[PDB]
Design a protein around this ligand. Structure first.
Ligand code: ATP
Length: 253
């Protein structure tokens, strides 16, 4: 799902092409909305395990105290809400690729257990002493500055240096050249399908604005802007009056 031929993204693609056949852990950083899960899936797709599962553990979408349960599973009655026995994400990912997305959300106690798991594939369901293991290739991602998280004592140093093997620093959208308008056009077609519309072009002022705007929310912000336009309007072309706040006003400062 990567779109873009820009110089810094072609450097990302070279990393992916050369590292994907390895089982080496890839560690992805970049600003919010830069495509870290798309990048992770592209590593999976380029790897020999492309036809096996690609599982993303989205830590910022799981209640913090339940990430362990979601990752490792749990036996019935392990804790107050453990109504059923649960299969962990690690079992879903066996023989495939496991993305630990936004893993700096994990609390220090979970990080201590993760340290075992990433070395051997060994884990226990919450509530149980029984050990199992799985075969997974890791990809990690965070929006945080990992070295700052380690310095402030929020992320384990031993864990970081065993995960941080092949780094990818995704470029922010504002540094991606022709990619902004390439992604915008692809989103215009996708959102047109989603809304039952037919947008395909941008006027010249919109092209200029989108190319120069700093996109502090990166590709998610661009997705939200295109969705806003296609939901609210019906045209073949995006016009400057359609661009939502605060794009124009922030660019003016
Ligand atoms: N290069 C790209 N080309 C096309 N679509 C992209 C690209 N990068 C990201 N996207 C789209 O943007 C959305 C966000 O991607 P992803 O979830 O990979 O981002 P993230 O960096 O993990 O950030 P967020 O934390 O905002 O979710 C997805 O719908 C994805 O398809």
């Amino acid at each position: 799902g990567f779109i873009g031929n820009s110089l810094p993204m072609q450097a990302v693609y070279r990393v992916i092409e050369s590292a994907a056949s390895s089982k080496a852990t890839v560690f992805i950083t970049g600003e919010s909305g830069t495509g870290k899960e798309v990048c992770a899936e592209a590593i999976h797709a380029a790897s020999p395990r492309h036809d096996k599962p690609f599982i993303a553990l989205n830590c910022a979408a799981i209640p913090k105290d339940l990430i362990e349960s979601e990752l490792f599973g749990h036996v019935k009655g392990a804790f107050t809400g453990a109504s059923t026995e649960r299969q962990g994400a690690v079992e879903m990912a066996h023989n495939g690729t496991l993305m630990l997305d936004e893993l700096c959300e994990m609390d220090l106690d979970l990080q201590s257990k993760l340290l075992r798991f990433i070395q051997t594939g060994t884990y226990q369901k919450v509530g149980s002493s029984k050990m199992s293991s799985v075969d997974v290739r890791f990809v990690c991602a965070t929006n945080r500055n990992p070295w700052e998280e380690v310095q402030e004592g929020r992320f384990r140093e031993d864990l970081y240096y065993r995960l941080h093997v092949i780094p990818i620093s995704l470029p922010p959208l504002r540094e991606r050249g022709g990619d902004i308008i390439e992604i915008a056009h692809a989103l215009l077609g996708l959102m047109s399908l989603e809304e039952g519309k037919s947008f395909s072009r941008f006027s010249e002022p919109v092209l200029r604005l989108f190319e120069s705007y700093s996109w502090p929310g990166n590709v998610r912000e661009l997705q939200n802007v295109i969705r806003n336009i296609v939901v609210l309007n019906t045209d073949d072309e995006v016009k400057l009056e359609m661009v939502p706040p605060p794009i124009l006003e922030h660019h003016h400062h």
